[PDB]
Write a protein that binds this ligand. Structure first.
Ligand code: FES
Lengths: 142, 76, 80, 156, 128
RNA sequence: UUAACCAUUGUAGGCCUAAAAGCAGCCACCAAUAAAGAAAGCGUUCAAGCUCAACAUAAAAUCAAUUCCAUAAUUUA
């Protein structure tokens, strides 16, 4: 069973959100964090990362990870930790063209996240759509 | 981290914020291919904006077709 | 089912029933369910051979058989 | 028509009955209209009914027959009336494994719209203007040609 | 009654997408899809890129009309059912063959070398 | 349109929410893929995960005719 989580690499044992949820299906929690910790060393600590762990009936771990979230990074780029109540029209940060594009190039490196598209228009829409989800307006230039 | 608008717009501070990746400077706009800055920066392509003969037109129209059924499904 | 063998000739006239039934046999979920089965696909009238350890050999031809019967026949056979 | 012979099983497509050539009413989209039988058959015409019925009395699918829904309901109703009337001795139900008839007397019936099993008795007939009506025939067969001076009385 | 009476392209773009790819690729190796996921199909496309082949696919219900409005009208037997389309413009028989080796369970119907109906075994024999 | 099958990835997207990821609230409402609803009923410590919609569509079935109290009956113009 594929379980999707966004836990930050810095904390390999968040507790309730991962420990018991995976344990309910029946797994070794300590084993999960160690393999997750292996990703943590390779990746920057303290940044949310999407995971694609598969919990098989055999009580084995198949941990698959990708590039860190653009959504939280956009929040960090906009200097926003906690956004506005709605964020549909509330905006606290503006992102120009260049910042939008540097990150899109980096994004096009992982198998997951459908980052094999030849056109970069695929990448912009996700981050633009992600920005719309956040309390951020992607203005052309400020 | 960077806290200068000039450095923000003249140096790639957001491209990498890891420890192994050091903030790299921005090359000139001409130093990158034209398609990099020609990507769609406007709002999501609407049925009018989408070309009737574009795959996104039908795919988004298919998404719209799901929306109407979903609206019906929610009421049930 | 220890082994499942499906044979059909695309170059000659190929019956749809066997091919449609073949896709179900060559399915990731189906293969996992009957993990014991060894999936072998023969491509060159069509003949499908299914072998059981108990000695029951079940061979299916789709020329005059609908896919529904083939799936039903195997499904009961697999349960044993 | 495919028949399965049976472990290894073999299915052979066998000869299927062919419609007689020269339909009386060519240009008929539905087989019943092709033969000008739209409103001139009844449950008593078992010969026609048997063609559309399973060997044990089950209904054949409309798609295979290809006839229109209006006749399908009429034909299905006619077969039900004939079956309930014991007019289809060769299409009697298949006994599950080795069962035998209940051996109780079977009442002779015809023009039976509904199963006799599921019809409750009518204790109170009613007075002059409260008389209860007895259903005879089926509404599906209303359009059938009538040779009487006045339209047939469905309610008896 | 109407049933008794005497007898009395929406998808349009998807032509262009399929028309472009097939016209480019003379021989199409046809293998039935094993209920594969979208992400895997992209991965297999890169796997074919190792083989210099492309998994360019679209709803197969429009694949049957492709022959109706395209360069050829006689490849319908090739595209029978829901199947992965291996479209190759070069006669690299070995590259096509090892595509089959990548997934044993998945069946390869064959390759229409020069847009001529053929089987997998025939494809290899003729391609040789 | 709706009868039969199938269901990937971005992103657990931001929001007081411990956490709410389509599915507590709350947002605006896009992308990739052949085909995916920033979600429709389910499931909800929260999610995974069930289906409905995605791609495929099957194949069905504009209203009727205190104690009963003649007996009955659908076709000869
Ligand atoms: S008799 Fe013509 S529609 Fe059936």
């Amino acid at each position: 069973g594929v379980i999707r989580s966004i836990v930050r690499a810095g904390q390999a044992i968040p507790g309730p959100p991962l420990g018991p949820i995976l344990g309910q299906r029946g797994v070794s929690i300590n084993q999960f964090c160690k393999e997750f910790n292996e990703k943590t060393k390779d990746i920057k600590e303290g940044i949310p990362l999407p995971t694609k762990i598969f919990i098989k009936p055999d009580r084995t771990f198949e941990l698959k990870i990708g590039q860190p979230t653009v959504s939280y990074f956009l929040k960090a780029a906009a200097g926003i930790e906690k956004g506005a109540r709605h964020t549909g029209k509330e905006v606290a940060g503006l992102v120009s063209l260049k910042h939008v594009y540097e990150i899109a190039c980096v994004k096009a490196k992982d198998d997951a996240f459908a980052m094999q598209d030849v056109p970069l228009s695929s990448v912009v829409r996700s981050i633009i759509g992600s920005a719309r989800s956040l309390g951020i307006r992607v203005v052309k230039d400020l | 981290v960077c806290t200068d608008p000039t450095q923000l717009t003249t140096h790639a501070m957001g491209v990498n914020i890891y420890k192994e990746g050091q903030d790299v400077a921005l090359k000139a706009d001409s130093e990158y291919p034209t398609w990099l800055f020609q990507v769609n920066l406007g709002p999501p392509k609407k049925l009018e904006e989408l070309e009737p003969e574009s795959r996104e037109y039908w795919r988004l129209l298919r998404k719209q077709n799901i929306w109407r059924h979903n609206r019906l499904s929610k009421n049930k | 089912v220890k082994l499942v063998r499906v044979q059909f000739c695309p170059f000659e006239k190929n019956v749809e029933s066997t091919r449609t039934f073949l896709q179900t046999v060559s399915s990731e979920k189906v293969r996992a369910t009957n993990l014991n089965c060894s999936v072998i696909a023969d491509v060159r009238e069509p003949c499908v051979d299914v072998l059981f350890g108990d000695g029951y050999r079940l061979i299916m031809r789709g020329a005059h058989l609908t896919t529904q019967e083939m799936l039903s026949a195997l499904a009961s056979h697999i349960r044993d | 028509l495919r028949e399965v012979v049976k472990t290894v099983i073999e299915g052979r497509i066998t000869e299927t009955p062919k419609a007689t050539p020269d339909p009386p009413n060519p240009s008929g989209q539905c087989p019943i209209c092709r033969w000008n039988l739209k409103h001139k058959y009844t449950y008593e015409d078992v010969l026609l009914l048997s063609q559309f019925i399973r060997p044990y009395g089950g209904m054949l699918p409309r798609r295979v027959t290809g006839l229109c829904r209006e006749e399908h309901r009429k034909i299905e109703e006619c077969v039900k009336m004939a079956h309930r009337a014991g007019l289809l001795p060769n299409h009697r139900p298949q006994l599950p494994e080795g069962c035998l008839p209940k051996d109780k007397p079977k009442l002779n019936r015809y023009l039976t719209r509904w199963a006799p099993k599921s019809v409750k008795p009518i204790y109170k007939k009613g007075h002059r203007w409260n008389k209860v009506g007895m259903a005879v025939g089926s509404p599906l067969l209303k359009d059938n040609v009538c040779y009487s001076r006045r339209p047939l009385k469905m309610m008896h | 009654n109407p049933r008794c009476l005497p007898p009395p392209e929406s998808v349009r773009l998807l032509r262009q997408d399929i028309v472009a790819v097939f016209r480019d690729n003379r021989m199409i190796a046809v293998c039935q899809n094993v209920a594969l996921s979208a992400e895997d199909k992209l991965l297999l496309r890169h796997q074919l890129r190792k083989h210099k082949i492309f998994i360019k696919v679209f709803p197969s219900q429009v694949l049957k009309p492709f022959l109706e409005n395209s360069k050829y009208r006689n490849l319908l037997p090739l595209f029978v059912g829901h199947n992965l389309l291996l479209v190759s413009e070069e006669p690299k028989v070995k590259e096509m063959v090892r595509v089959l080796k990548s997934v044993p369970f998945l069946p390869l119907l064959g390759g229409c070398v020069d847009d001529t109906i053929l089987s997998r075994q025939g494809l290899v024999d003729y391609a040789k």
